[PDB]
């Protein structure tokens, strides 16, 4: 049970100092600036106060039940601090400190875990950059001080890339419920975390950067991940998904290369979506975060040009998604304003002559139609339109539609389109600067629907 890890009443920071360059000090600053409302206890031999907070020489001296100890002392001091934390009844030890199994000191790491468990204490890491939980206004990392609030829980086995991607979520407008650095995974791992996020009402999507899982942990991983998948999509970025890369990634952790093909199968049986890149992972996460799953396969594509529509068709085809004729009712509605040389084969081509208002009317008609399950809206900037005008039309259409059907948007053009795409994403409408990315995002929604169906059938009685 990790309730007290993500929602602690009291957090100790071991390794903080007057020196603002120290890791512990950076963590302490983030904790205060992000607005943690519980009690924070800096731990330091000499200082009587740090950042206006009463400092103590040891966690055991704290006149309070400490739930979480954030440990950033040198590795040769970690065990001593663990004993003190145990004495104090600390439930969770978050070991930032590196220099364990990943540098060949497997013995020290195993002892860390063994001594933690003897006190009933669980360990996160070691060799991590900390963790963040937005619902508790808790930023116990030395990464960026802030992230956008949302329903995405991001678990990373990587340190540098993890902390960098933390910042990247801001640029990509991804709302975060949680960031968790798991590093060496000496104790708490993906399984344990997935169990928590399953029960977390604040988390709707789970993205995991995964290098590998521990021997004998795979079966339980599938059991947990599949059940989670029934209600919440899981996206995995797999490090070493090629034969060649698997070997390389076995050095950075200090292990042996697991079978690529079997990992792929395990992910399929778990209903997990595997992203081959950071960009795909973020693009899919965005869509899955801001949309419900399509209730059926009747997908409509709307475009002011055949060119984008063909790119969309090809991209959908690559994902085993094939478009079908639109409902006649929808065609009639669109024909109220569209020219005679327009295509209704799906994608519906309202031609490059389309002014802004047509995007509103078309989108509205589509979303309102009972025989439409999803909509991808494609736009190519022309002199006849304004990108922001089109974006607002789509926003108004989605609102007036009064329902929640999956929508993705692809806009192509200059700086004005860049602004319009940004506007839409800040409205939590999945918008992308190309038709292929918009359609890949929509494909991700269908991929999750199919993965979830796979798990359901697999669990049939």
């Amino acid at each position: 049970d990790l309730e007290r890890l993500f929602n602690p009443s009291a957090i100790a920071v071991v390794g903080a100092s007057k020196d603002p360059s120290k890791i512990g000090s950076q963590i302490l600053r983030n904790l205060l600036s992000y607005g943690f409302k519980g009690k924070v206890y800096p731990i330091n031999p000499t200082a009587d106060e740090l950042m206006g907070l009463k400092c103590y020489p040891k966690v055991s001296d704290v006149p309070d039940k400490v739930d979480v100890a954030v440990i950033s002392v040198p590795s040769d001091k970690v065990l001593g601090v663990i004993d003190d934390c145990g004495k104090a009844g600390v439930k969770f030890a978050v070991v930032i400190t590196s220099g364990f199994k990943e540098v060949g000191n497997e013995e020290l790491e195993e002892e860390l875990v063994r001594r933690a468990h003897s006190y009933g204490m669980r360990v996160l890491g070691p060799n991590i950059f900390g963790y963040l939980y937005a619902p508790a206004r808790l930023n116990a990392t030395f990464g960026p001080k802030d992230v956008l609030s949302g329903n995405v829980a991001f678990i990373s086995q990587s340190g540098a890339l993890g902390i960098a991607l933390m910042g990247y979520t801001v640029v990509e407008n991804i709302g975060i419920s949680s960031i968790v650095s798991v590093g060496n995974k000496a104790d708490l791992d993906d399984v344990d975390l997935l169990d928590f996020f399953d029960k977390d009402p604040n988390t709707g999507v789970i993205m995991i950067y995964l290098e590998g899982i521990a021997p004998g942990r795979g079966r339980m991983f599938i059991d947990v991940a599949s059940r989670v998948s029934l209600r919440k999509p899981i996206i995995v970025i797999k490090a070493g998904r090629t034969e060649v890369g698997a070997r390389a990634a076995a050095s950075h952790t200090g292990s042996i290369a697991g079978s690529v093909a079997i990992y792929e199968s395990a992910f399929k049986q778990s209903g997990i979506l595997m992203a081959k890149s950071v960009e795909d992972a973020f693009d899919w996460t965005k869509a899955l975060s801001w949309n419900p799953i399509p209730e059926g396969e009747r997908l409509i594509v709307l475009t002011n040009g055949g060119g984008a529509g063909v790119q969309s068709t090809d991209t959908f085809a690559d994902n085993g998604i094939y478009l079908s004729k639109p409902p006649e009712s929808l065609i009639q509605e669109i024909k109220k304003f569209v020219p005679p040389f327009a295509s209704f084969a799906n994608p519906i081509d309202i031609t490059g002559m389309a002014p802004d208002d047509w995007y509103y009317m078309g989108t509205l008609a589509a979303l309102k139609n009972p025989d439409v399950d999803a909509l991808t809206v494609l736009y190519c900037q022309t002199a006849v339109t304004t990108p922001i005008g089109v974006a607002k039309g789509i926003v108004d259409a989605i609102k007036e539609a009064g329902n929640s059907k999956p929508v993705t948007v692809g806009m192509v053009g200059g700086p004005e389109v860049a602004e319009a795409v940004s506007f839409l994403n800040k409205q939590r409408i999945a918008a992308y600067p190309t038709p292929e990315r918009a359609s890949s995002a929509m494909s991700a929604l269908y991929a999750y629907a199919r993965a979830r169906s796979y798990v359901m059938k697999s669990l049939a009685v």
Binding site: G212, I213, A214, P215, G216, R217, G218, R219, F221, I222, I256, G258, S259, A261, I262, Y263, S265, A266, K268, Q269, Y454, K457, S458, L459, A460
Partner: protein
């Protein structure tokens, strides 16, 4: 219990089940095999030959033998009682003077396997995910092209079906020039049971069902290899 086979092999310090033992064990889990009998006498070899139907194959059964053909302990295409009596004694003599210090358990009488579409069904133990089932088409398709699919056990019906359809040589199961479609349901059934074998029997390190022959109705494991730990 069929586990007696495993326990017996282990108690004698063997790291593998004999050919006939592997088939008995596989059969008891409901996986079809080409019919076989262990002959303890010439008269039993003859009686069993009539039981199993001609033509039959005869082989020596002994832990020491590894290549029966090389040692002159495989007689093929026996069609009559007379031929079986000959093959029986030919094998006793040949092996008894090519591997003199040999502890023979008996002679194996094996049913003929009509030709069909060959399949590979495997079971291995992966460090992360434990018992895992492997599927593929036989011949070059596995041996040369390595066209195989994997599913972590236990297998659902959905796991078995999807892993079958997943392989690149799938079309060979759905009808092609000079060959009718084969029993996909039989294959799914066998895959699921192979997985169950792997989950339930910790002491089985590896299992190889190869060749397996698929027909328009049912399948038949021709050879089975089981490795112990």
């Amino acid at each position: 219990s069929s586990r007696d086979l495993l326990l017996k092999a282990k108690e004698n310090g063997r790291k593998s089940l004999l050919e006939h033992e592997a088939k008995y064990f596989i059969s008891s889990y409901g996986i079809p095999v080409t019919n076989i009998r262990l002959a303890k006498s010439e008269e039993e070899a003859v009686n069993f030959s009539r039981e199993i139907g001609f033509p039959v194959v005869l082989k020596i059964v002994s832990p020491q033998v590894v290549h029966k053909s090389d040692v002159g302990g495989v007689k093929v295409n026996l069609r009559s009682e007379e031929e079986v009596r000959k093959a029986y004694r030919e094998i006793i003599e040949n092996v008894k003077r090519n591997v003199p210090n040999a502890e023979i358990e008996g002679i194996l009488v094996q049913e003929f396997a009509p030709p069909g579409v060959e399949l590979i069904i495997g079971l291995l133990r992966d460090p992360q995910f434990g018992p895992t089932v492997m599927f593929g088409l036989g011949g070059v398709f596995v041996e040369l092209f390595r066209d195989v699919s994997f599913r972590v056990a236990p297998l659902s019906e959905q796991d078995a079906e999807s892993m079958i359809k997943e392989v690149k040589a799938y079309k060979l199961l759905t009808g092609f020039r000079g060959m009718e479609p084969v029993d996909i349901e039989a294959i799914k059934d066998a895959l699921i049971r192979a997985g169950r074998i792997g989950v339930e029997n910790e002491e089985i390190a590896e299992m190889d069902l190869n060749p397996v022959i698929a027909y328009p109705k049912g399948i038949k494991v021709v050879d089975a290899r089981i490795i112990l730990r």
